[PDB]
């Protein structure tokens, strides 16, 4: 099962498909059996994605240790039948933090995995944005990394006087910094959201392009 | 809400997105009010599709008269903000027939609409296959038309001794005639179908490419 990415056609949107690893898959579960089941299921799904020619595949990392996830992935690349781009889904801020080990934690997560895959050009990041935002020294660090996309939940938009979704001022400054890299966009939480309502989130982001 | 088309990468699959008109939309309902509501909703959805850059849009025709559907569509093209390809979803055989007015009926449907849009190069057909198949004189007629895609329900596949989906011999001869035009494919009925099971339908079609 897949997911739609939206890439701004302004340098007018464009839409493409990326695959998503089933959520129950946890290659680094403390438990032995889950590791084996998950390592198996991950390859099933990576090859199904390559078979469909999906241009990228979304793999989540939300803990310190991802040795198992790195290995299965390196193995799958070696075969030669690969979607040829892998976007690691990483939170800008750790969710457990909100009810260098500080705000730079999730960066280390990525950086460590990045080095485990020998700085593979096939591996990039899909950054997940929350309500809390970290400092600028850590925002700077992330912007050196290869971000292909940004993941924005509907829950971080405010509604304005007129009743439409808009980004907080802090959040606006961040996003603008992301449309400078031409990233693609993913919007989560479209559940219970009419297709005419979901359209406005994109309208706003297109407006935000000129600010 | 959208739909995935699969285009064979052999001349190895490829996947793209086409939009689908909401089903409750019936621009030629006998009832007045539905016509007005549907004519309005159709344009909402066509423009949402153009805004996302969807390469094609699926519009169903399953009756004789489609004057309303042709007009709204011609109007939407004139604006200039259009997905730039429209695939009309037409049954090879009328479903009401199975519990020139004969087996050529659904062709006339298309041909009549085709002429209402002044043989617009933006308008093509997405042909829907059932269990019943019509003669060859009518199959010939259709193959002169511009078929961009073929719609195949899981329900028309047999299972073979080994327990996998395969096409009836009659159905195999038809499909082969369709992979000669390089059409794209759409598979309906993926409900209650594991992603590993759905993968086999495509495997079969890729095999069928060499027969």
């Amino acid at each position: 099962l897949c997911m739609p990415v939206f890439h701004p056609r302004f340098k007018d949107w464009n839409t493409l498909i990326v695959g998503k690893l089933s959520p129950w898959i946890r290659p680094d579960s403390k438990v032995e059996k889950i590791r084996r089941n998950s390592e198996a299921a991950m390859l099933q799904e990576l090859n199904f994605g390559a078979y469909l020619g999906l241009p990228a595949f979304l793999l989540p990392l939300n803990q310190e240790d991802n040795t198992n996830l790195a290995r299965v992935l390196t193995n799958h690349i070696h075969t030669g039948h690969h979607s040829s781009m892998f976007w690691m889904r990483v939170p800008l801020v750790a969710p457990e933090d909100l009810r260098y080990s500080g705000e730079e934690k999730t960066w280390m997560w990525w950086h460590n995995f990045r080095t485990l895959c020998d700085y593979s050009k096939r591996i990039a990041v899909a950054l997940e944005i929350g309500a809390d935002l970290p400092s600028n020294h850590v925002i700077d660090r992330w912007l050196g990394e290869p971000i292909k996309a940004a993941i924005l939940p509907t829950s971080i938009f405010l509604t304005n006087k007129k009743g439409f979704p808009v980004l907080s001022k802090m959040h606006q400054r961040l996003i603008f910094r992301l449309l400078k890299l031409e990233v693609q966009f993913i919007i989560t939480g479209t559940n219970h959201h009419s297709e005419k309502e979901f359209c406005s989130y994109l309208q706003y982001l297109e407006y935000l392009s000129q600010n | 809400l959208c739909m995935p088309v699969f285009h064979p990468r052999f001349k190895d699959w490829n996947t793209l997105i086409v939009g689908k008109l909401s089903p409750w939309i019936r621009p030629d309902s006998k009832v007045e009010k539905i016509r007005r509501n549907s004519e309005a909703a159709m344009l909402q959805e066509l423009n949402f599709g153009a805004y996302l850059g969807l390469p094609a849009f699926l519009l169903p025709l399953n009756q004789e008269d489609n004057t309303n559907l042709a007009r709204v569509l011609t109007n939407h093209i004139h604006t200039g903000h259009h997905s730039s390809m429209f695939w009309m979803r037409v049954p090879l055989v009328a479903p009401e027939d199975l519990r020139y007015s004969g087996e050529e009926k659904t062709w006339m449907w298309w041909h009549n609409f085709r002429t209402l849009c002044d043989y617009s190069k933006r308008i093509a057909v997405a042909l829907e296959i059932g269990a019943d198949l019509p003669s060859n004189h009518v199959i010939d007629r259709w193959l002169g038309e511009p078929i961009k895609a073929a719609i195949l329900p899981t329900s028309i596949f047999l299972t073979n001794k080994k327990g996998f989906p395969v096409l009836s011999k009659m159905h195999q001869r038809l499909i082969f005639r369709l992979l000669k035009l390089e059409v794209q494919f759409i598979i309906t009925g993926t409900n209650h179908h594991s992603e590993k099971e759905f993968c086999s339908y495509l495997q079969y079609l890729e095999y069928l490419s060499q027969n």
Binding site: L158, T159, K161, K162, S200 | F48
Partner: peptide
């Protein structure tokens, strides 16, 4: 998909 006046205005509240 037809933009209206004030669509993109800032939330004058949080």
């Amino acid at each position: 998909s037809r933009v209206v006046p004030g669509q993109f205005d800032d939330a004058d509240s949080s």
